[PDB]
A = this chain, B = another copy of it.
Amino acid sequence: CVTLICTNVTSNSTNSTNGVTNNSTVDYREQLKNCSFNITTEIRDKQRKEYALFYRLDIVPINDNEKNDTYRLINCNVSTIKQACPKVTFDPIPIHY
């Protein structure tokens, strides 16, 4: 739950007719981002810059003036968040009541 400076990942070759128009917008397009951030290292007093790829849905823009392309995870807004342990599995097993 810190600042994220995100950017889309790779360029494309979208062209063809028509041309006179400029900006497009579509709600149905699954797309990733390339978010960057500083996180604490082994010691509280220091921290380092990491990058991760986040689904646009999972992030939300924040209006900062000191920087551009700034986002945050949707939850820092509302609730705490934990990561599913690697060992555990949510495989639907038949259970008998």
Contacts and interface: CB of A to CB of B under 8 A. Distances in A.
A2 B45 contact: yes
Nearest to A60: B42
B72 A1 contact: no
Q: How many copies does the complex hold?
A: 2
Contacts of A77: 42
A36 interface: no
A43 interface: yes
Most buried by B among A3, A43, A77: A43
A2 B72 contact: no
A72 B42 contact: yes
Interface of A: 1-3, 38, 42-46, 62, 72, 76-77
